Amino acid sequence: SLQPPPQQLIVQNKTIDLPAVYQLNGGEEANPHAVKVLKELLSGKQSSKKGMLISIGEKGDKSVRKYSRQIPDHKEGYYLSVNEKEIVLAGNDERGTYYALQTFAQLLKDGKLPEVEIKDYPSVRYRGVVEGFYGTPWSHQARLSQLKFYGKNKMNTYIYGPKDDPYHSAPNWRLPYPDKEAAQLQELVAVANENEVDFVWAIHPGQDIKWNKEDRDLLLAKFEKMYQLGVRSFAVFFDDISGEGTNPQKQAELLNYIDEKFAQVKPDINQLVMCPTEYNKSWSNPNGNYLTTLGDKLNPSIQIMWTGDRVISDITRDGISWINERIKRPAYIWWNFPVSDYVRDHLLLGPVYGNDTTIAKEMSGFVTNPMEHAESSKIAIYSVASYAWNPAKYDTWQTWKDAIRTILPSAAEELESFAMHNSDLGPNGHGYRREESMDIQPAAERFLKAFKEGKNYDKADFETLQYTFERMKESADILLMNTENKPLIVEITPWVHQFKLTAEMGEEVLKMVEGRNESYFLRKYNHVKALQQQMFYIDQTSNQNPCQPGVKTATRVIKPLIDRTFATVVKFFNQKFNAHLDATTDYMPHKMKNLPLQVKANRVLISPAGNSEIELDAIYPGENIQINFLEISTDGKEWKTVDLKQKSRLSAGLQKAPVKFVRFTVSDRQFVLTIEK
């Protein structure tokens, strides 16, 4: 179950016991970070000249002289061997020896090891994570846990650049970090050194940069300050800006100046990376030369980032050849998944897939932009680690499961059950979607076809939907009480509650389908109406972010099935008993075309596309109104007019006037009312 899978592996079907007495060779000349891991696995057991020999070292150390032809000639490569007589842990360099110990740890199970020989190295030079999303940046504790996660999975790159960090971007990118933040970054560097991770500190100055010597010197003095805190890798981001910062000639000259007077003057600087203004094909200029200007001017040692054909996209062979021909070097991939800062009411916990597995030679690096929930991003981050190290053997679904069993061994099935139905994005401006609920979709669709048109449904499909809802409630309850990874549970709790209510509503709707007598039907109908109101309450109190507030879950297949079945059986009931039950699926306290009202924060809106009127559930102080292509009231009858101001964009302030009724009548497609709460 080795992850990432080695490049060469030979297994024997013999097993040996971890030596109760051993003899260590090279503990004083091999990588201290590797030796530490090794003595943790050996602790309690006896060290002496007598007993089984264990040899650790880098190529060149006396300890591994006998094995120098077995060691691959690759950066961060290594050689591992286990048999009845000895154990050999030999890297090509110090990082190779560490990675050798990471594979060693997985092999050890029940104090036993397999007789095995491994020769291994990475297909992609730089592999890791870039924290470059919009929203609440990762807490200090989350980042400490991230960096240890990367070393176990042989990730060698952590790029720091949260967009909402003011000392990284606007407005204070010229200012050194305050003492509290500086000591915290100094600890992150230490921890990342211990885990063999390059800490890349980025800076995002392009929105108000001036191409003079004052800003150029200040950017360097900040880089020097970051250097004093330990940083040895650096990046400059020019994404999502307007104005003079988009000049490719000035951008290249700045990065070349950083190379020659900073990166070439220090003794120990590693990566130097920049992100271009045009960072995807769809947004580049055909009548232009931005990318060819960078490609010709940028020093060859400086990397250039790229998200692919679009802002959210999969990386193909056509797409990477399109950019490599222009920038005149292999691209440094910035892959925007599972980042969710444009769909903040969803969790994206599905598998990693869609990236070509034969283009390892065509890319300098590969980093994933994750979500603001750090522990939840581990599922996809684990998969990127596997993909980037050995793409030729990358198995999508098997790594998704292996990730889940590593993140939460105590309740892995319960978490897989949760993630299976929390992976799609819903409709979004990028048109980027993922698979969800694929195992139950066939039976779901067959049940609803037959149900809508009087035919009998297969009893097996009906039982498959009952089995689903029942297991959903098991996982929700078990996950909420799980203390193995308390940070993970805290992140997902609002979705876990909504998950459970979805499942309860599902069971009640299926009982409406069975529908024995009239009295039972109305009982289940009233219970569904209560569950709807409960889902509304969570949606309005939990995760009230300023962008897409609320909580959505199981949206691709499960929620449409429950809503469509509820609407259908309610209409059959009204036809049979001549009744007038409400068939609407989402609770809404306000009232009144078929466009439903929405409540987002303190806003009340109509969904975008004598006359008509909106009635609130009470009186509220009014703030403003916005319409895009006349009167208000508090009791219905006594109205009053306020006029609008145009600039498509009609606005008007209410200035705290009491309001309950709003009307538009016949005078000269968003439509929003903002109130005070």
Ligand X SMILES: *CCC(=O)Nc1nc(OCC)c2ccccc2n1
Residues marked as binding for a protein?
132, 163, 239, 279, 334-336, 341, 369
Could you say which of 134, 211, 353, 664 contacts ligand OAN (CB under 6 A)? 134
Residue 454 contacts which entry, Ca ion, ligand X, ligand OAN, none (Cβ below 5-8 A, type-dependent): none
Residues that bind Ca ion (CB under 5 A): 29, 58, 61
Q: Tokens in use for 23?
A: 């003899």
The reply on whether position 11 binds ligand X by CB under 6 A is no
Could you say which of 81, 336, 377, 565 contacts ligand OAN (CB under 6 A)? 336
Catalytic site residue 240? yes
The reply on whether position 429 binds ligand X by CB under 6 A is no
For the chain, after which residues does the C atom lie more than 2.5 Å from the next written residue's N, i.e. where is it broken? 592, 609, 612, 629, 647, 665, 668
Residue 409 is classified by DSSP as G
Would you say 108 and 3 are in contact if contact means Cβ atoms under 8 Å apart?
no
The reply on whether position 238 binds ligand OAN by CB under 6 A is no
Q: Tokens in use for 200?
A: 């890349």
The reply on whether position 165 binds ligand OAN by CB under 6 A is no
Per rule CB under 6 A, count of chain residues that contact ligand OAN: 16
Q: Which is nearer to ligand X, 101 or 312 (CB)?
A: 312
The reply on whether position 165 binds ligand X by CB under 6 A is no
Q: Which is nearer to Ca ion, 28 or 458 (CB)?
A: 28
For 543-598, where are the alpha helices, taking DSSP H only?
558-577
* Shortest Å distance, C-beta 620 to ligand X: 24
Distance in Å from the first CA to the final CA of the chain:
53
Q: Which residues contact 230 (CB under 8 A, 6 or more apart)?
A: 185, 186, 189, 190, 193, 199
Q: Which is nearer to Ca ion, 29 or 215 (CB)?
A: 29
- Break the chain down into helix, strand, coil percent, rounded to 5: 40, 20, 40
> Which residues line the annotated binding site?
132, 163, 239, 279, 334-336, 341, 369
For residue 98, count CB atoms less than 10 angstroms from its CB and return exposed for 0-12, middle for 13-18, buried for 19 or more: buried
The reply on whether position 134 binds ligand X by CB under 6 A is yes
The reply on whether position 485 binds ligand OAN by CB under 6 A is no
Q: What are phi and psi of 555, to 5 degrees?
A: -85, -20
The span of 131-139, 148-156, 221-229, 528-536 binding ligand OAN (CB under 6 A) equals 131-139
Instruction: Identify the bridge partners of residue 650 per DSSP, sorted by sequence position.
Output: 627, 646
**Which x/- pattern over 191-230 shows residues binding ligand X (rule: CB under 6 A)?**
----------------------------------------
Q: Which is nearer to ligand X, 67 or 134 (CB)?
A: 134
Residue 547 contacts which entry, ligand OAN, ligand X, Ca ion, none (Cβ below 5-8 A, type-dependent): ligand X
Residue 307 contacts which entry, ligand X, ligand OAN, Ca ion, none (Cβ below 5-8 A, type-dependent): ligand OAN
Could you say which of 300, 454, 546, 608 contacts ligand X (CB under 6 A)? 546
In angstroms, rounded to a whole number, what is the distance separating the alpha carbons of residues 322 and 325? Answer: 6
Handedness of CA 515, 521, 526, 527 (dihedral sign): negative
Would you say 97 and 103 are in contact if contact means Cβ atoms under 8 Å apart?
no
9-44 burial, b for 16+ CB within 10 Å, e for fewer?
A: eeeeeeebeebeebbbbbbeebbebbbebbeeeeee
In angstroms, rounded to a whole number, what is the distance separating the alpha carbons of residues 524 and 529? Answer: 9
**Which x/- pattern over 338-357 shows residues binding ligand OAN (rule: CB under 6 A)?**
-x-xx---------------
Could you say which of 170, 547, 595, 601 contacts ligand X (CB under 6 A)? 547
Q: Which is nearer to ligand X, 133 or 469 (CB)?
A: 133
In angstroms, rounded to a whole number, what is the distance separating the alpha carbons of residues 515 and 522? Answer: 10
Residue 262 contacts which entry, ligand OAN, Ca ion, ligand X, none (Cβ below 5-8 A, type-dependent): none
- Work out the angle between the directed axes of helices 486-514 and 459-480 (0-180°, nearest 10): 150
The reply on whether position 239 binds ligand OAN by CB under 6 A is yes
Q: Among 77, 86, 92, 75, which residue's Cα sits nearest to residue 8?
A: 77
Of all residues in the shown chain, the one whose CB is closest to ligand X is 547
Residue 546 contacts which entry, ligand X, Ca ion, ligand OAN, none (Cβ below 5-8 A, type-dependent): ligand X
* Shortest Å distance, C-beta 168 to ligand X: 14
For residue 644, count CB atoms less than 10 angstroms from its CB and return exposed for 0-12, middle for 13-18, buried for 19 or more: middle
* Shortest Å distance, C-beta 432 to ligand X: 12
Over the Cα atoms of the chain, what is R_g? 30
Residue 61 contacts which entry, ligand X, Ca ion, ligand OAN, none (Cβ below 5-8 A, type-dependent): Ca ion
How many of the other CB atoms lie within 10 Å of CB of 525?
Answer: 19
Q: Which of residues 356-395 bind ligand OAN (CB under 6 A)?
A: 369
Given the residues 165, 208, 240, 259, select the one marked as catalytic.
240
Q: Which is nearer to ligand OAN, 33 or 204 (CB)?
A: 204
Taking each continuous run of H as one helix and of E as one strand, the counts in the chain are 16, 24
Q: Where do contacts with ligand OAN occur on this chain (CB under 6 A)? A: 132-134, 163, 239-240, 275, 279, 307, 311, 334, 336, 339, 341-342, 369
Residues making contact with ligand X (CB under 6 A): 134, 240, 341-342, 546-547
Give the residue numbers marked as catalytic.
Answer: 240
